[PDB]
């Protein structure tokens, strides 16, 4: 039995995690770590828990050692559903498709800033900035404010770990206080001068039949923000790395663009930026072999599910043509990712431009293994130095 702490961010930065997952799925599908924390590791157990929200609740909060906050992802139905339908319309496949030109322009702009150099950090220069700009435009973040909001967002999720230092914990709290002050100013201004963005939509929203409190407005806005700017970035970087480490996949996708939809799904399965989500049990229950107590939280291990040999043949092989590919990177059930269509378009347009404008893109050193972020919620590549043949900007 692996001696691991599933709340320790270092576990998810270690490249031993998938070996630990394999042991869980084979010996104790609903695993208990060294501290007794329960975690569903099989595709089956995760699905079954997602399908029983009355037993596996979100109302205790989605994080292990953290109370629930006034945001829809920390809510059960009917309260959660009333919130989601306040922002549902703008995230449909058809409404997301309308933003194609805008997102494409952002992609080309970000590649223009490095194309003359012949080298860059794919994470810092392309993967991270693109979704920041996209969700920022939806939330009302000004372009000159993007880097600041992303710095706050980084500080909010980078140090989530049972082994967080006192100093790092203070960085997280300071960033939330900073975000809190700025956004409360924005919330009031959107009440005096309503605009088109999402914050303005929530500010003027009503739930049977009262307006949302300022505490909720701040938290719902943060939910959308972090969902946008701390997730897709990791599928971009980690998925592009798989194309670069298996250039037969890069080549295959290069000569046939119609394979891009399937490639995006395999990137999502492989990277699984959200490593887990918590569920609180409303009653004692025997769940797929493991006794669970009322009031304790069980983790849904999305990456473990995404490599479950019971569902995916040769899951350690990256195959852009993988069909079926019913991965659980976006989860399942009533909390199924709101921005799943937005994220897929972000990944498709950026990858399409990387293949076209950086056609000979390579890792600086294919031998070295790239470091992962030691956090217990969302995690991905810290950096990704790349090289390519320079080209003139498009303007």
Residues at the site binding ligand HEM, with contacts judged by CB under 6 A: 50, 72-73, 84, 135, 223-224, 227-228, 231-232, 235, 268, 273-274, 277, 302, 329-333, 335-339, 342-343
State the angle between helix axes of 214-229 and 166-192 in degrees (0 to 180), rounded to the nearest 10.
110
Q: Of 111-170, which residues contact ligand K2B (CB under 6 A)?
A: 156-157
Selection from 363, 290, 357 nearest residue 121 by Cα? 363
Residue 337 in marked binding region:
yes
CB of 170 to ligand HEM, least distance (A): 27
Percent of residues in the chain assigned helix, strand, coil, to nearest 5: 50, 10, 40
Q: Of 204-263, which residues contact ligand K2B (CB under 6 A)?
A: 222-223, 226-227, 230-231
- Closest CB to ligand HEM: residue number: 331
Please identify which residue in 37, 38, 73, 278 interacts with ligand K2B, judged by CB under 6 A: 73
Nearer to ligand K2B, 85 or 336 (CB): 336
Nearer to ligand HEM, 72 or 358 (CB): 72
- Closest CB to ligand K2B: residue number: 227
In angstroms, rounded to a whole number, what is the distance separating the alpha carbons of residues 391 and 394?
A: 9
Selection from 235, 198, 226, 213 nearest residue 84 by Cα? 198
DSSP strand pairing (38-40 vs 30-32):
antiparallel
CB of 172 to ligand K2B, least distance (A): 5
| CB burial readout 357-379, b (16+ within 10 A) else e | bbeebebeeeeeebebbbbbbbb
CB of 391 to ligand HEM, least distance (A): 28
Find how far residue 183's CA is from the centre of its chain.
22
Q: Of 49-68, which residues contact ligand K2B (CB under 6 A)?
A: 63, 66
Structure tokens at 363: 């890792």
Residue 39 β-bridge partners:
31, 299
| Interface positions with ligand K2B (CB under 6 A) | 63, 66, 73, 156-157, 172, 176, 222-223, 226-227, 230-231, 378
Output the known binding site.
Answer: 337
């Amino acid at each position: 039995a692996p001696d691991v702490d599933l709340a320790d961010g270092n576990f998810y930065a270690s490249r031993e995690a998938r070996a630990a997952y394999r042991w869980m799925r084979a010996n104790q599908p609903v695993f208990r770590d060294r501290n007794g924390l329960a975690a569903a590791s099989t595709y089956q157990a995760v699905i079954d828990a997602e399908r029983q929200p009355e037993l596996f609740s979100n109302a205790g909060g989605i994080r292990p050692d953290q109370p629930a906050l006034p945001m829809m992802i920390d809510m059960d139905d009917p309260a959660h559903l009333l919130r989601r339908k306040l922002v549902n319309a703008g995230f449909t496949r058809k409404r997301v498709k309308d933003k194609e030109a805008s997102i494409a322009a952002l992609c080309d702009t970000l590649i223009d800033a490095v194309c003359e150099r012949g080298e860059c950090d794919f994470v810092r220069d392309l993967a991270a900035p693109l979704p920041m700009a996209v969700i920022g435009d939806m939330l009302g973040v000004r372009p000159e404010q993007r880097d600041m909001f992303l710095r706050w967002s980084d500080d909010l999720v980078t140090f989530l770990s049972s082994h967080v230092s006192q100093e790092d914990f203070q960085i997280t709290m300071d960033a939330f206080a900073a975000y809190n002050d700025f956004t409360r100013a924005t919330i009031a201004a959107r009440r005096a001068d309503p605009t088109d963005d999402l914050v303005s939509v929530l500010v003027s929203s009503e739930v049977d039949g009262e307006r949302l409190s300022d505490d909720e407005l701040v938290m719902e806005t943060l939910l959308i923000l972090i969902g946008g700017d701390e997730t897709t970035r990791h599928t971009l970087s980690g998925g592009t790395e798989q194309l670069l480490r298996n250039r037969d996949q890069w080549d295959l996708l290069q000569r046939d663009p119609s394979l891009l939809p399937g490639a995006i799904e395999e990137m999502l399965r492989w990277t699984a930026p959200v490593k887990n989500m918590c569920r609180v049990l409303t009653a004692d229950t025997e769940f797929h072999g493991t006794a669970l107590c009322a009031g304790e939280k069980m983790m849904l291990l999305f990456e473990s599910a995404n490599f479950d040999e019971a569902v995916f043949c040769e899951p350690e092989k990256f195959d852009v043509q993988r069909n079926p590919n019913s991965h659980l990177a976006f989860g399942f059930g009533t909390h199924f990712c709101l921005g799943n269509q937005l994220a897929r378009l972000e990944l498709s347009l950026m990858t399409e431009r990387v293949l076209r404008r950086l056609p000979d893109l390579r890792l600086v050193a294919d031998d070295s293994v790239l470091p992962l972020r030691p956090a217990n919620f969302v995690s991905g590549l810290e950096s990704m130095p790349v090289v390519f043949t320079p080209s003139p900007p498009l303007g």
